[PDB]
């Protein structure tokens, strides 16, 4: 007779593009550099320059 767990759960259409922003997937991954820059751990080129120049002026 018919199966107790429904077979619909199993079926996927043959021409389907998976949606990664769906209920069963983890949050989107972040580029390490951008993450590190957002939290301040790595600084930009302009910032070293700004700091370096001011230090030179002080000296």
């Amino acid at each position: 007779g018919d199966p107790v767990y429904p077979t619909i759960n199993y079926i996927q259409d043959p021409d389907e593009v998976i949606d990664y922003r769906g209920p069963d997937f983890h949050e989107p991954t972040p580029n390490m550099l951008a993450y590190l820059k957002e939290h301040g751990k790595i600084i930009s080129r302009e910032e070293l320059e700004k700091i370096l120049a001011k230090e030179k002026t002080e000296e």
């Binding site: 922003r21 769906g22 209920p23 949050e27 989107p28 972040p30 580029n31 951008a34 993450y35 820059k37 957002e38």
Partner: protein
């Protein structure tokens, strides 16, 4: 969010904030969604509302309210069940539309584009 862009583009508001927006002036259409973490059908609405946002970027404001946090407001706005949306117009003479249930994305677009 300078380097990393936020994933979620629909924001939670409160009863007081909703009231200001309504009493004040607006120039683009307002859509308000009532939701609860507990309802299963709602998990599906959230995905749809986030897409409408990408499409109509500054041509609409889509906002969200949680029933657990603001139960009394919901009763006053006459909400009878959980997946419910209120579409409000930038003109203040026109009536607002309440839709109950999961409804398709095209219907949402038609209301915004034609009726509101």
């Amino acid at each position: 969010g300078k380097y990393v862009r936020e994933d979620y583009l629909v924001k939670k508001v409160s009863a007081k904030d909703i009231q200001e927006l309504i009493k004040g002036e607006r120039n683009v259409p307002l859509i308000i969604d009532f939701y609860a973490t507990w309802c299963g059908p709602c998990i599906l609405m959230a995905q749809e509302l986030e897409m409408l946002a990408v499409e109509y970027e500054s041509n609409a404001l889509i906002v969200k309210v949680d029933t657990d946090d603001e139960y009394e407001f919901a009763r006053d706005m006459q909400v009878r069940g959980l997946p419910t949306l209120y579409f409000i117009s930038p003109d203040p003479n026109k009536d607002a539309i309440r839709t109950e249930g999961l409804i398709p994305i095209q219907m949402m677009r038609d209301i915004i584009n034609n009726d509101l």
